[PDB]
Design a binder for this molecule. Structure first.
Ligand SMILES: Cc1cc2c(cc1C)N(C[C@H](O)[C@H](O)[C@H](O)COP(=O)(O)OP(=O)(O)OC[C@H]1O[C@@H](n3cnc4c(N)ncnc43)[C@H](O)[C@@H]1O)c1[nH]c(=O)[nH]c(=O)c1N2
Length: 250
């Protein structure tokens, strides 16, 4: 018998998916038990989030997964993997489609909180915004048909994408605003638009980000964005920041 002595809030997922959507990005779909397979019953949650190890080891980390508004069970994560790295090699050498991985983390992902009807900006750094984009659409389809602003950024871009996806959101409706990050990096960029988040610093000084500010990505957008706010003055009420994946956030 395997090890078992204290497991409250864990689920079982069968590795069947695991497709490479981008150069250093992959969408893993696991379904093997009630939670993210067939008995979890989804309906669009605040970016569901848990804690799991590649093969269940115990030295990985927590990742906010997303299924979609549908009572079934399908978790899809956007992990930034780098060929020859440390997780991408182990992902294909220990996370193939012939195994079982249990996810443990009856928790949520706090980063973007809409006040109902107000211009809010959510800047996600990277592709791990999968949960971000999921929760984003939920607000618009919920009762947030107002001005919903979203900030998307990463590296050079040739390795990333989803620009048209959010762009369509802006083209769709609800006073949407899409931010164009990246300048000329390559996948190691702390921030968004070429610069030390200086642009956002001025935005506070101007007007368009304060009431509700959502930050998703590296801890930098948290350190710098939080600094500009305290340095300038831009007093916010529904402002929130989250630390996910490497560089890509303010
Ligand atoms: C609530 C919450 C929510 C999340 C997360 C945590 C928490 C608490 N995380 C973090 C989570 O731990 C996640 O699984 C890891 O940070 C992913 O790192 P790997 O272990 O996959 O590293 P991995 O070993 O794969 O390391 C990736 C490496 O790839 C290289 N690289 C990155 N981008 C590149 C590019 N464009 N071009 C070339 N090389 C590049 C870099 O050198 C980088 O260090 C996350 N993580 C995540 O990725 N997405 C998410 O959505 C979330 N969400």
């Amino acid at each position: 018998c395997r090890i078992s002595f204290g497991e409250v809030g864990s689920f079982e997922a069968e590795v069947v998916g695991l497709n490479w959507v981008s150069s250093n990005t992959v969408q893993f779909l696991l379904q093997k038990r009630p939670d993210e397979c067939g008995n979890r019953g989804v309906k669009f949650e605040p970016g569901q989030f848990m804690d799991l190890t590649i093969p269940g080891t115990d030295v990985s980390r927590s990742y906010s997964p997303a299924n979609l508004p549908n009572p079934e069970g399908r978790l899809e994560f956007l992990i930034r993997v780098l060929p020859e790295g440390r997780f991408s090699d182990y992902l294909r050498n220990d996370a193939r489609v012939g195994q079982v991985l249990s996810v443990k983390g009856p928790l949520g992902v706090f980063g973007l909180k809409e006040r109902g009807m107000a211009p809010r900006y959510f800047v996600a750094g990277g592709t791990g915004l999968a949960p971000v984009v999921s929760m984003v659409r939920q607000m618009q389809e919920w009762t947030a048909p107002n001005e919903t602003r979203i900030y998307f950024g990463v590296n050079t871009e040739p390795e990333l994408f989803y620009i048209d996806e959010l762009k369509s959101l802006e083209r769709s409706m609800r006073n949407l605003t899409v931010k164009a990050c990246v300048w000329h990096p390559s996948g190691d960029w702390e921030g968004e638009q070429g610069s030390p988040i200086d642009a956002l610093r001025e935005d506070l000084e101007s007007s368009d980000a304060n009431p509700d500010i959502y930050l998703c990505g590296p801890p930098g957008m948290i350190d710098a964005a939080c600094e500009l706010v305290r340095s300038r003055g831009i007093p916010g009420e529904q402002v929130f920041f989250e630390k996910f994946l490497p560089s890509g956030a303010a």
